[PDB]
Design a protein around this ligand. Structure first.
Ligand SMILES: Cc1cc2nc3c(=O)[nH]c(=O)nc-3n(C[C@H](O)[C@H](O)[C@H](O)COP(=O)(O)OP(=O)(O)OC[C@H]3O[C@@H](n4cnc5c(N)ncnc54)[C@H](O)[C@@H]3O)c2cc1C
Ligand SMILES: Cc1cc2nc3c(=O)[nH]c(=O)nc-3n(C[C@H](O)[C@H](O)[C@H](O)COP(=O)(O)OP(=O)(O)OC[C@H]3O[C@@H](n4cnc5c(N)ncnc54)[C@H](O)[C@@H]3O)c2cc1C
Ligand SMILES: CCC/C=C/C/C=C/CCCCCCCC(=O)O[C@H](COC(=O)CCCCCCCCCCCCCC)COP(=O)(O)OCCN
Ligand SMILES: CCC/C=C/C/C=C/CCCCCCCC(=O)O[C@H](COC(=O)CCCCCCCCCCCCCC)COP(=O)(O)OCCN
Ligand SMILES: CNCCCC(=O)c1ccc(O)nc1
Ligand SMILES: CNCCCC(=O)c1ccc(O)nc1
Lengths: 425, 425
């Protein structure tokens, strides 16, 4: 049969499948859906005929992501410097200043203090060890309660909250402080670095690299949703919705953490993992592309709106543009366009909304979640364990990366590790 | 005779003398020079007839200095908000920006890192304990060597150095890193706070408060330089240059640390103090007032010039102003006016120097030093010990304050303590 079956056709799965193959193994890639890429997804725009857009993962930074840089280099995939912001319309109160960093000096001493406390806590985290193994339980509290102890003033406090909401894709009352600290550590112990790293984009979309990687996997089955994995025997048996079983010495689960509860594992996974695997992670990130008329180029807005961030995405024509909001799907209904007009108009009262485009990750059975973000309490109970092997079954993907949790990079990184675990044994 | 003699007629000495008196004791104040105030010294300007100027200590901040605030409140001494800076002519390289905080974002991540390390080290310091008692010897190295390990880029690195030079009144190769960290801690663990606190001035000069305080001391002898203090007997004997001895149960030395080596103490001071008392501290701060024509109002310059800082001091007329440079007297000769024109012109090539005014603290036998700043090594050998009693002799003054070393505030603070030590016993 096969040396490995890889379940799931996103970047994690794609790298694994290609790497083992180049190692000379016999590998099958099984993809539940009708395309490769998973949460990296360029398509043509619902709003603008002829325009290609990223409806998932978009932004990379080469100094922060060596594994991604080399893929881009390996296949000559051109990147482009992401949108430079030149025009600032914040909702941060009358003392904010319209710059990218809108903190007034009247606030500077407080920022300098809070920055120190913030980074002091982040320095507690050792990245390789896992969040559940370090006595961090005091920090796994709600983000809003934590940011209350920083004694921050209006502009900087609200600025902090807005970006955290955008990044974590959770309202402050649901986001774990520990997890915010984790993203800080992931970035070489930089708060600033967490935002300064959405920095480049693919010039022809993520689909570019998706194709390069697949042009090198020989056996791929789309529309093949896995429903069971069984390793009670000498050889792992992988069973499928409408179709037969496939068999292998080794199985890589490269599907989203929040999907693992819909698969039947034999034996059942280790007791420690089950509860969290059941509940899933709390990530509710929601990314909406907005077709607008009237917006000038290079707009950036941060503020206390239901959209925390709203900024320039693309030029369409000289009257028209796409913008991007982030916010979360628990707090917002993207199908109430009335609400969208309100949210936008809040920052930019002179602009007309022509239409919106997005994908509803949380509702896609193939995904069930956008990017990972633990619920409060979850990742100090179990975290590193989640992406650890259970027998001959391996778990990879951004959702479980310890080094770069959440990013294309971490999908690439958890794969390399599995490929190694297989190759060595 | 007297319950106390206070030696030295600066703020430290003035508060003591007044406080003991109000306690009802019998107190003599002995002042070596021809005025009261010491290193707080307003006079009429050498350059501008009719203009009153501060040739010593000038700047206060009420939130940072409760002891000073209450003096000002006690006597209704009016302050004025110090010069707001509106115009910026830095020498920090082509990427600096002409703002008060001239760091470019291209530099921001590095600043955020360095700020963290800087404050982490400063948090090692416990203020009450004394610098010699905490295992800080690793930090008592030269400032330039320390600032090399922060890996700072041009603008921020040079900005940091310029303000440190100004503050410590020492070139980077002679200043102790530990001492820079000490000023950071003194300020509630704030780097920013070290400069944001030169913030108010006396509207009628420091002489205002000097008079208020003396209007309440009943026995004062000027031109009375002390040369010996002897406590071998039952009652302390204090002997004078051209004149008799005075006697007291208790003596307060409120004269500058760098003068104590010219006094004969019986018995000799404790072995630990003697070496440092001999060498004196390394402070070489030099403050020059420059009368100029052509300068616009509100100028501030920071840079890599021989003047680290050069900024607006006062308006004179609509063509004329005073500015203030700081720099150090080891590195600069203020009697080479050619050099002064060069230093100024470096930042402001369009401006004409009319004249300069300053006092040469380091050369004044009554002072022998401007503000305190240890030499490298000194204050981790002995620091708290220096301002500790030796028998019935007490040492006060800014030079020895642990809480606010260097400031009028710390002169007020070390006095309160002595007054207490005397009263309790
Ligand atoms: C809105 C949004 C914006 C983002 N923006 C960025 C960004 O700017 N920068 C960045 O670095 N990252 C970004 N990300 C994160 C990044 O996209 C993902 O975390 C990463 O691409 C995940 O890749 P993966 O290989 O781990 O999982 P996925 O790409 O999710 O791949 C999992 C695959 O499994 C398949 N699958 C699911 N169930 C089964 C089944 N049982 N059987 C077979 N196949 C199955 C799915 O079809 C999918 O193809 C963003 C994510 C979202 C949701
Ligand atoms: C240029 C300069 C600028 C400054 N700027 C500021 C500022 O902006 N803000 C701030 O808070 N602080 C500032 N300071 C610091 C502050 O002025 C001093 O540290 C503080 O005033 C010292 O007061 P003191 O009472 O300890 O000593 P001093 O004021 O120095 O008093 C000592 C007194 O002892 C007398 N004396 C010396 N020898 C004898 C002798 N043997 N017998 C009798 N009397 C003797 C002297 O005449 C003097 O009056 C500045 C200092 C300088 C030099
Ligand atoms: C004893 C050692 C001496 C060391 C001192 C070094 C630094 C002292 C510099 C003090 C002057 C800063 C003034 C603030 C600017 C201002 O008032 O005017 C403001 C500009 O102020 C800012 O934008 C500052 C933003 C906050 C930064 C906080 C980060 C702290 C990092 C510490 C940096 C350390 C130095 C670098 C190594 C103009 O718009 P606004 O008035 O509407 O807002
Ligand atoms: C996961 C949690 C998310 C938390 C993220 C929160 C903060 C992210 C904000 C990122 C955008 C900053 C961009 C820098 C501005 C710029 O490029 O453009 C610059 C303005 O930049 C600056 O002046 C910044 C000065 C340096 C500040 C360093 C202090 C760090 C303190 C940390 C602050 C923490 C937030 C407050 C709590 C304009 O002139 P320039 O291009 O010629 O220079
Ligand atoms: C845990 N990872 C949180 C970051 C989520 C994420 O990758 C992402 C990337 C870009 C953006 O604009 N918002 C969120
Ligand atoms: C140890 N104290 C260092 C600060 C020296 C000092 O008090 C001072 C005050 C104002 C100024 O502009 N430069 C120096």
């Amino acid at each position: 049969m096969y040396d490995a079956i890889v379940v799931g056709g996103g970047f994690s799965g794609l790298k694994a499948a290609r790497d083992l193959t180049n190692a000379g193994k016999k590998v099958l890639l099984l993809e539940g859906g009708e395309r490769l890429g998973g949460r990296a997804y360029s398509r043509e725009s619902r709003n603008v005929p002829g325009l290609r857009v990223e409806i998932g993962g978009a932004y990379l930074h080469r100094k922060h992501h060596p594994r991604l840089a080399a893929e881009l280099d390996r296949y000559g995939i051109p990147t482009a410097a992401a949108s430079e912001f030149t025009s600032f319309r914040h909702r941060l109160g009358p003392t904010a200043v319209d710059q990218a960093f809108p903190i007034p000096g009247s606030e500077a001493v407080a920022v300098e203090a809070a920055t120190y406390t913030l980074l002091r806590d982040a320095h507690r985290i050792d990245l390789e060890k896992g969040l559940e193994n370090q006595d961090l339980e005091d920090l796994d509290i709600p983000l809003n309660e934590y940011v209350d102890k920083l004694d921050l003033p209006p502009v900087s406090r609200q600025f902090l909250l807005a970006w955290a909401w955008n990044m974590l894709g959770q309202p402050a009352d649901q986001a774990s402080a520990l997890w915010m600290l984790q993203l800080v550590a992931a970035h070489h112990y930089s708060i600033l670095g967490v935002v300064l790293s959405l920095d480049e984009v693919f010039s022809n979309g993520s689909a570019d690299l998706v194709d390069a990687m697949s042009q090198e996997i020989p056996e791929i089955r789309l529309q093949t949703v896995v429903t069971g994995i069984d390793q009670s025997g000498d050889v792992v048996n992988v069973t499928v919705k409408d179709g037969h079983a496939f068999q292998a010495h080794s199985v890589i689960v490269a599907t989203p953490m929040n999907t693992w509860r819909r698969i039947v594992f034999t034996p059942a996974l280790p007791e420690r993992r089950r509860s969290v695997i059941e509940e899933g992670h709390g990530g509710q990130g929601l990314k909406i592309l907005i077709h607008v008329r009237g917006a000038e180029a290079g707009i950036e807005c941060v503020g206390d709106g239901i959209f925390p961030t709203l900024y320039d995405y693309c030029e369409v024509s000289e009257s028209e543009r796409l913008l991007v909001a982030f916010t979360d799907s628990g707090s917002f209904d993207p199908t109430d366009i009335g609400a969208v007009k309100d949210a936008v108009l809040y920052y930019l009262p002179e602009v007309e909304v022509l239409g919106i485009d997005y994908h509803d990750w949380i509702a896609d059975p193939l995904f069930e979640g956008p990017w990972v973000a633990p619920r409060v309490g979850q990742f100090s109970r179990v975290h590193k364990e989640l992406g650890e092997p259970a027998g001959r079954i391996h778990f990879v993907g951004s959702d479980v990366s310890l080094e770069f949790p959440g990013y294309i990079e971490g999908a690439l990184e958890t794969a390399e590790c599995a490929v190694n675990a297989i190759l060595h044994s």
